[PDB]
């Protein structure tokens, strides 16, 4: 029973070193990966704290050690996300300055292409709608309008998909 | 009818200049502010495209111009979010390097304090639970365990709140 608590305290004072001065990337988690890790580890910690209290109350020491170890693992990943998220917050500040790596420019390109495609298609949609407003008796242009609306819909779906990961 | 379409095309080719080379902060939107702006402008654009097609079909030119202008405003804010989000993606890459501004270090501090408080409280919770596991007949320590669980719950709520804005 004491070993599970001793090891948990040793791991907790080690993972706090990330929180002391986080000015460098801790891991490869995005800002959404950090929050998702916080949400999942919070649910794991919530049931782990429940198991800690109940098994200490019921004298169920084996399951108590499992709850202690589960809580330790949850708290470590909880801080790895908070440490990386704290790094991303200060770096994403408008008054900061950053040199963008080639792998960074390769990651923002799927967002730039999808947005520039949307303006190109939405422009042609407005150009087509400008003529349909004067003369809607134009079956070919309604096909062109539908074609641009299809490229707009795809460019937006691919833009949101590029940001959620 | 033509003016609403001409002004929309002029605004669209102006806002695309943000997409050409986004290596600087465009606005004060966070990465969550960028995605939220994309989601809201997508709903506005969806109904605007509906109004563009229907009013061109029905010859309702005044409401057609309103739909064109609404679509133009939606597409501009749509790209202002994508341009800033593209900047944040490449800057948040682990292989990048960034000088963090004082206002940036002031924004990550609410995340760092809430996380370091959580480890401090969860450590005391495990320390208290270690004794309750041996002797649960300790009313004062159950109050101490409840006190640390209250500080853990508050530090986690304040940590998530610091990241969602």
């Amino acid at each position: 029973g004491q070993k599970e608590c001793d090891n948990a305290l040793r791991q907790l004072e080690t993972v706090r070193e990330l929180l002391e001065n986080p000015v460098q990337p801790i891991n490869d988690m995005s800002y959404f990966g950090c929050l998702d890790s916080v949400m999942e580890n919070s649910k794991v910690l919530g049931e782990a704290m429940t198991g800690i209290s109940q098994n200490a109350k019921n004298g169920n020491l084996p399951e108590f050690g499992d709850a202690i170890a589960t809580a330790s693992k949850a708290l470590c990943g909880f801080t790895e996300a908070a440490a990386q998220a704290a790094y991303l917050v200060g770096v994403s500040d408008p008054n900061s300055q950053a040199q963008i790596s080639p792998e960074g420019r390769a990651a923002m390109e799927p967002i730039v292409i999808s947005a520039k495609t949307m303006l190109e298609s939405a422009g042609g949609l407005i150009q087509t709608a400008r003529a349909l407003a004067v003369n809607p008796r134009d079956p070919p242009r309604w096909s062109v309008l539908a074609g641009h609306s299809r490229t707009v819909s795809d460019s937006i779906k691919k833009l949101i998909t590029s940001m959620r990961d | 009818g033509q003016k609403e379409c001409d002004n929309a095309l002029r605004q669209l080719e102006t806002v695309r200049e943000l997409l050409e080379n986004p290596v600087q902060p465009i606005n004060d939107m966070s990465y969550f502010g960028c995605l939220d702006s994309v989601m809201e402008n997508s709903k506005v654009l969806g109904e605007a495209m509906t109004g563009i097609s229907q009013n061109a079909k029905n010859g309702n030119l005044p409401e057609f111009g309103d739909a064109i202008a609404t679509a133009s405003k939606a597409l501009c804010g749509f790209t202002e979010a994508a341009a800033q989000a593209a900047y944040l993606v490449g800057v948040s890459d682990p292989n990048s390097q960034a000088q963090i501004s004082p206002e940036g270090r002031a924004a990550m501090e609410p995340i760092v304090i809430s996380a370091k408080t959580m480890l401090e409280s969860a450590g005391g919770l495990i320390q208290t639970a270690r004794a309750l596991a041996v002797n649960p007949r300790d009313p004062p320590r159950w109050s101490v365990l409840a006190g640390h669980s209250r500080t853990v719950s508050d530090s986690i709520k304040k940590l998530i709140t610091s990241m969602r804005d």
Partner: peptide, 24 residues
Amino acid sequence: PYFVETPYGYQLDLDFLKYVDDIQ
């Protein structure tokens, strides 16, 4: 809602609105 029937049988693609609703 995820599509709009235009004249002459063509469709206005609004599947990106379906993508937004499935997320939320």
